[PDB]
Structures are given as C-alpha cells and as structure tokens.
Design a protein around this ligand. Structure first.
Ligand SMILES: [Ca+2]
Length: 279
C-alpha cells in the first residue's frame, strides 16, 4: 500500500533515505493487533480513529483527553491518515491528567492494568504498549515497565526530552523495554532527545503531524512522538508475523536503518526504525 503526501515520519519509517513523502506499508496494517496508549487519554470519537479507538481505564474523574497529548500519540500509532498501523485496535489508559501530569503511583497502576487487561481484549496478532511519559529514575516505575513487558506486551517508552543520558529517567532506563529517542526530518538527533546506552532505537519525533482533541490536528515534537512510531511499527510487524512482543524491540533494532543519524553521542545506538517494506 502507498499513502502519498504522508507525514514525513511515516514516510521515513518506510524508507532507506530521508527526504521522501510517501508512506509504504503492507495493507494488513496491524489488523488483529492492539496498542495501549498510556497517557492523557484518547479522543476516541475523532473521525481519524474510525471506531477503532476506545478508552478502557482512567484514574481521574473523567476518561476524556482534556489535553490532546494522548490523542496525538494514539494518532501516530493508528489513525487512518497519521498512523503507522492504520488497522490496529487502540486502547486508552488515562494515567496522566489534563495538565499532562501523573503521580508515579498512578502510572505504575496503569502499567499493571494493561498487563491484566490484555486478557480482556481480542488481540490475536499481539499486544503493544506506548508510554510517552517519564520522570526521574525510579526502580518501582522501571519494575512496573518490566512486568508489563514480561507479561507479553511489547513495551515502547520515550527516552525523555532533556538532551541528557536516559539512564537517569524512568521508565526510559529500564533495560527490558524498548526505549525510543527522537530524530528530525533531516536525520539529525532531535535537539531535545535523550541519549545513552539504555536507548534501543530512534523514531521520528520533530515536527510530527497527528490528531488532536476537538477533532483536529497539529504538529508537535518530543520523544513522546517518536515512541508511538515504534509502537505502531511493532504492532504492524506483529500482524505480519515477523516478530512477537518479546522480540519486537530486538527485531526493530536488527532491521533498522543503521549509521544514518547525525549528532548521535558516542556509545548511543545509531538505528532508525524502518519497516523494511518492499512494495
Ligand atoms: Ca530500554
């Protein structure tokens, strides 16, 4: 399949080189997979989700996304125009309030929720979780991310936006999950992207167009935006039968564009997520 004039990040993920604008992907499109977006929520009613998004949990007085952040992320995962996995099922878990904030304790609870909740969902091709959030190092937060992963969910997390070593952030520093740095359309490490040995992969994160609340769209930037590209990619690859929740991060690293990014600090992987799709 070919989507012309796609957001640059979608095009980049199906390309061996920067500077193209068409997104190429197998039409299976992540059908039969599920992605949990653990964030400010999802405006499920957005036309771009086509009935494939649902709120499953909130820790606040509402499950609506009163921010837009969770909605943007979900859109990059699986909206029809702005999504990597255009046919995946999207499940929203509101651990972050409408200011985008959340106590670590609620975030942990949300991770443990998904690990159980996938047993109440129909996801024959596999389960992915996209965590575009983080804070300072916490062993409890990392442990929760490690449980979610061990349970059979492909866990993708943001490296963080401090232009700093991600070892000092959680869940970014957890070894057993997929930690995702950000790049721009010229293949530079995004100026705010964290780095370090704990990163597993980079995805598009600068100037990323996706869905927003009020049924609109906008371009914003962050390792928050890179993460859902990798999450959507994993879901897509799982439906293709190429990989599984336990091996998807490795598989993506293995099949990545390699050595192509600039301003990657010494000791950080130079790998850009790539679907290796041959149209
Ligand atoms: Ca990691």
């Amino acid at each position: 399949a070919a989507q012309t004039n796609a957001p640059w990040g979608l095009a980049r993920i199906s390309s061996t080189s920067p500077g193209t604008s068409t997104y190429y992907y197998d039409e299976s499109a992540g059908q039969g997979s599920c992605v949990y977006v653990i964030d400010t929520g999802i405006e499920a009613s957005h036309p771009e989700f086509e009935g494939r998004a649902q709120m499953v949990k909130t820790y606040y007085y509402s499950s609506r996304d009163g921010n837009g952040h969770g909605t943007h992320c979900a859109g990059t995962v699986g909206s029809r125009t702005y999504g990597v996995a255009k046919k995946t099922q999207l499940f929203g878990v509101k651990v972050l309030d409408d200011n985008g904030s959340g106590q670590y304790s609620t975030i942990i609870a949300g991770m443990d929720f998904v690990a159980s909740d996938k047993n109440n969902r129909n996801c024959p091709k596999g389960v992915v979780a996209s965590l575009s959030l983080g804070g300072g190092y916490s062993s409890s937060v990392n442990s929760a991310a490690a449980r979610l992963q061990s349970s059979g969910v492909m866990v993708a997390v943001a490296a963080g936006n401090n232009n700093a070593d991600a070892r000092n952030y959680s869940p970014a520093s957890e070894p057993s999950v997929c930690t995702v740095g950000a790049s721009d359309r010229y293949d530079r490490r995004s100026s705010f992207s964290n780095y370090g040995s704990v990163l597993d992969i980079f995805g598009p994160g600068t100037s990323i167009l996706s869905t927003w609340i009020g049924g609109s769209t906008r371009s914003i930037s962050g390792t928050s935006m890179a993460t859902p590209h990798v999450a959507g990619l994993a879901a897509y690859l799982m439906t293709l039968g190429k990989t599984t929740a336990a091996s998807a991060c490795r598989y993506i690293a293995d099949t990545a564009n390699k050595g192509d990014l600039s301003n990657i600090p010494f000791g950080t992987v130079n790998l850009l997520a790539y679907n290796n799709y041959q149209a």
